[PDB]
Amino acid sequence: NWEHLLSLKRQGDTAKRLRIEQDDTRLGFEVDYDRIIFSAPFRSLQDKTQVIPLFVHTRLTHSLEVSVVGRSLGRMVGKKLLEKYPHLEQVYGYKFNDFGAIVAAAALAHDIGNPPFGHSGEKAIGEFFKNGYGKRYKDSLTAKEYQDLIKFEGNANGFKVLSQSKPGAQGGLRLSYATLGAFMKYPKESLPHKPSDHIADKKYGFFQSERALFEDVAQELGLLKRSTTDDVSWSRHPLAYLVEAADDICYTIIDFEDGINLGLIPEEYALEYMVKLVGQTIDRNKYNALQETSDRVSYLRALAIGTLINESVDTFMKYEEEILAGTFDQSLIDKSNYQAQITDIINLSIERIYNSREVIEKEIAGYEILSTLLEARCRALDNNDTHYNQLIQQLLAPKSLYENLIQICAEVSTMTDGKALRNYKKIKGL
Amino acid sequence: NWEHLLSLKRQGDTAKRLRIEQDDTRLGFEVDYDRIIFSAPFRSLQDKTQVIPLFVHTRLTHSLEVSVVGRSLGRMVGKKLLEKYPHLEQVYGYKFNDFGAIVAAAALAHDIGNPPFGHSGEKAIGEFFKNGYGKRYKDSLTAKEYQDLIKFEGNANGFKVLSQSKPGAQGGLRLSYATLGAFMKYPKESLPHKPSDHIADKKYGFFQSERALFEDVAQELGLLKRSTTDDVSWSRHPLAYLVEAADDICYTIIDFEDGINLGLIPEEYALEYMVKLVGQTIDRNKYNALQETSDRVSYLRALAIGTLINESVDTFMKYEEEILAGTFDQSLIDKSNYQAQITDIINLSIERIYNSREVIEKEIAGYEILSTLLEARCRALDNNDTHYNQLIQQLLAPEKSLYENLIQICAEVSTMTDGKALRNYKKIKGL
Ligand SMILES: [Mn+2]
Ligand SMILES: [Mn+2]
Numbered sequence A: 001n002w003e004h005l006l007s008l009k010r011q012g013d014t015a016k017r018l019r020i021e022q023d024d025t026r027l028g029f030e031v032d033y034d035r036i037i038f039s040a041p042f043r044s045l046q047d048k049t050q051v052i053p054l055f056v057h058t059r060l061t062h063s064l065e066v067s068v069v070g071r072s073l074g075r076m077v078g079k080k081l082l083e084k085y086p087h088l089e090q091v092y093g094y095k096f097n098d099f100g101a102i103v104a105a106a107a108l109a110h111d112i113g114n115p116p117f118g119h120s121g122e123k124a125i126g127e128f129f130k131n132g133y134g135k136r137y138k139d140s141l142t143a144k145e146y147q148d149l150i151k152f153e154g155n156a157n158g159f160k161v162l163s164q165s166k167p168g169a170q171g172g173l174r175l176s177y178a179t180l181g182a183f184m185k186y187p188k189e190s191l192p193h194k195p196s197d198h199i200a201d202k203k204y205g206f207f208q209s210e211r212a213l214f215e216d217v218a219q220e221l222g223l224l225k226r227s228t229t230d231d232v233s234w235s236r237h238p239l240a241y242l243v244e245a246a247d248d249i250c251y252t253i254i255d256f257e258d259g260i261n262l263g264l265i266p267e268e269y270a271l272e273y274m275v276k277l278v279g280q281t282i283d284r285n286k287y288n289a290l291q292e293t294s295d296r297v298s299y300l301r302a303l304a305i306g307t308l309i310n311e312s313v314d315t316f317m318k319y320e321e322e323i324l325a326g327t328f329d330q331s332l333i334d335k336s337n338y339q340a341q342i343t344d345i346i347n348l349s350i351e352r353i354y355n356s357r358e359v360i361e362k363e364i365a366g367y368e369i370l371s372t373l374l375e376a377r378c379r380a381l382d383n384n385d386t387h388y389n390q391l392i393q394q395l396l397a398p399k400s401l402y403e404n405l406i407q408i409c410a411e412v413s414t415m416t417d418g419k420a421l422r423n424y425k426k427i428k429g430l
Numbered sequence B: 001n002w003e004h005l006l007s008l009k010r011q012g013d014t015a016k017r018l019r020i021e022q023d024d025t026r027l028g029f030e031v032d033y034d035r036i037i038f039s040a041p042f043r044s045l046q047d048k049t050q051v052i053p054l055f056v057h058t059r060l061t062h063s064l065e066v067s068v069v070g071r072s073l074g075r076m077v078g079k080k081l082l083e084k085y086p087h088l089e090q091v092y093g094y095k096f097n098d099f100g101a102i103v104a105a106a107a108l109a110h111d112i113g114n115p116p117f118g119h120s121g122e123k124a125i126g127e128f129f130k131n132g133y134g135k136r137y138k139d140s141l142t143a144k145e146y147q148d149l150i151k152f153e154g155n156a157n158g159f160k161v162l163s164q165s166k167p168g169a170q171g172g173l174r175l176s177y178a179t180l181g182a183f184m185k186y187p188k189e190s191l192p193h194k195p196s197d198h199i200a201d202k203k204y205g206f207f208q209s210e211r212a213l214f215e216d217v218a219q220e221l222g223l224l225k226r227s228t229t230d231d232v233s234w235s236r237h238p239l240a241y242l243v244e245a246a247d248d249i250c251y252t253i254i255d256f257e258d259g260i261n262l263g264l265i266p267e268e269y270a271l272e273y274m275v276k277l278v279g280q281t282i283d284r285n286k287y288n289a290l291q292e293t294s295d296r297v298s299y300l301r302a303l304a305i306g307t308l309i310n311e312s313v314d315t316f317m318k319y320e321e322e323i324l325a326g327t328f329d330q331s332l333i334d335k336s337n338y339q340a341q342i343t344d345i346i347n348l349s350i351e352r353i354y355n356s357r358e359v360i361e362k363e364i365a366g367y368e369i370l371s372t373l374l375e376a377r378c379r380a381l382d383n384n385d386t387h388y389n390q391l392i393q394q395l396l397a398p399e400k401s402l403y404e405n406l407i408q409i410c411a412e413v414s415t416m417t418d419g420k421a422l423r424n425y426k427k428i429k430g431l
Helices: A028-038 A040-047 A059-084 A096-109 A118-130 A133-140 A143-150 A154-163 A177-183 A208-221 A240-261 A267-278 A284-289 A293-318 A320-324 A339-354 A357-382 A387-396 A401-413 A417-427 B028-037 B040-047 B059-084 B096-108 B118-130 B133-140 B143-150 B154-163 B177-183 B208-221 B240-261 B268-278 B284-289 B293-318 B320-324 B339-354 B357-382 B387-396 B402-415 B418-429
Strands: none
Touching: A028 A040, A028 A096, A028 A177, A040 A059, A040 A417, A059 A096, A059 A240, A059 A293, A096 A177, A096 A240, A118 A133, A118 A143, A118 A357, A118 A401, A133 A143, A133 A357, A133 A401, A143 A208, A143 A401, A154 A177, A154 A208, A154 A401, A177 A208, A177 A240, A208 A401, A240 A267, A240 A293, A240 A339, A267 A293, A267 A339, A284 A293, A293 A320, A357 A387, A357 A401, A357 A417, A387 A417, A387 B118, A387 B357, A417 B357, B028 B096, B028 B177, B040 B059, B040 B418, B059 B096, B059 B240, B059 B293, B096 B177, B096 B240, B118 B133, B118 B143, B118 B154, B118 B357, B118 B402, B133 B143, B133 B357, B133 B402, B143 B208, B143 B402, B154 B177, B154 B208, B154 B402, B177 B208, B177 B240, B208 B402, B240 B268, B240 B293, B240 B339, B268 B293, B268 B339, B284 B293, B293 B320, B357 B387, B357 B402, B357 B418, B387 B418
């Protein structure tokens, strides 16, 4: 039910928060966005690389653009949802901007827990615990505690970042449960691993340390169960599909834009790859009058993103009842009439950007930087009495074993590119 | 006996050196100072870090300031000792500046054996032999030889630097035995480890390689034997307490000063922590007229050092007979009426300087630099036959026991300036 899915609950609440009694200048969903903007984890995205080493998008500007696309998706979907379910507005007091605000906030935070150097950063952390120094802990951990480490997931670390309790600050950012639900695109634990080909099963969305919190979130929202074993799993909050589409749209089109501006993709390819996405709306005489590459490609990007937003809204509304019943199996973009063109764009970016020598060099270096930092933290954990290990604790980190290891991963993951490289260089004498 | 404690003997001497027969213009104790100044090991302190990386004090300017403070301590104590025991001057010919000379020279040399990167430097060397590559030598060494390595001690390496013979240079710098006695603030071997809580038992002062040398020094000075087993130790030469006091006074107050001028310690802490130490001697009109932070804090530093020197002289004379009998169980500064203020100063320096990111980072890097140089030297020692290991020997060290080879490797890595250690390190790693 949408009334439950739009929960304003915050962690620890003892009483219900009715939408009709909200102060509209202090709307819980919009406070959520402001809390993320000013948070230390969001600010650190300023100094973190998205794909191409550091104009190129950093994590912060990527997340900003995704939240803008997400707000537009949520606004347009919210308006059609309120005309489909008019009791949501007439009885309960919901407004179209509420949906825009939920998606905008979840989208703003979607990459907040990701480690440096991208997917290699996650693999480097995983490999450290699978076959590196961290392997020795296996027998002291449950299967799921260990799986959290060997398949260390940035989405799950983001949920920890958003909700972590510390002295003086229980509940992290204390976001609305509707926002936490829109954030959670993999509502399952680390095991079982990929139980189906469904997008929501491709990874997992919370660590064992956050399991009890997401249990509270899922019951408050009324999310549908996807497992009746002790391995817990739920169907995605409907608005998580819009967070994912905003993200899909932005890195597809905007990585392409960056690749052209950086000279990694020949400009000769720009129209060829964008023509079907922009063909009906492009003012071609205007395009031909633009004198700078960056102006031409930003014009194409805006048209293609506009095309994909409108189509994504229609796809959501067309499958709304399957999404509400937890039986929708794909992403919104999987259903696009432009799936062939999106795939061509992504494949060109893989060939020209992700496999460029510079991106490869960064990923290889990132493996050495993260492995070194994890080994130093973990040896210091195992022997905190030696002089060297006390120095290491003082430089990098001034509980149960699992809690200690998952915290080490979270702290390594949240270091800025320059801070991780500086610490690595000092540990190695440079 | 003070007549034997003030020995002018140098290594290898075949005849006695009477104080009454010394040429005043070439006094043995004063020549010791000149020999240290011009030595290669002392010069190398130019380019060696004390706490903060490279105005900031280096090991050289620190050692210089300690020797000046030590010269005053020894002059003042020397005057009072000669009034207490007038026969030392009237019969034996000793003068109060002799005591200043002995303390000043020993204090000038007190950090001459210290490795680069501070006390993390020593710990990095010990860690190499405890848990690093050097652990493989444990079963080929005696317990005290291995302990020399895993608790590698800058003070013991200093004694090696000052005294060790080489072809054409028997006896090292050949300092007077009274000076070597005042240098030795831990007169014991590496084992047993901390047999008591007395400051003199905290560390050790000579390697096994130098045990026979200090036995000669201790016998000539008449130091009281403190241990009777095959584990040897002696009660400290009385003047070693003054060397230790001058060192304690300097790094306590001067590190604090440095930390304020670097911005690590807000200036307001200066007056607050040092008001007791300066209040009876400070000219407030002068203080209030000084316009620069660095001028205000250096004035407070001068006043606080002057206060602690005077007090330390008094403490020494109060416990002089217990020190002469080897029953004094503390440092002179441990007895200070300002121990509350000294402790506060040290704790803030630890928090704001020693634990600063800059120092932590430098110490962490030094561990890797020293471990790498040590491993290259030991691998080349273990397999001198390979082309690579011959290149390493040409680069870093262009017939003795395994223990003597390992102690020399440690001494030579310790001799390197910060810069030369980094360059050799970079070459080995190819940077
Ligand atoms: Mn993203
Ligand atoms: Mn010193």
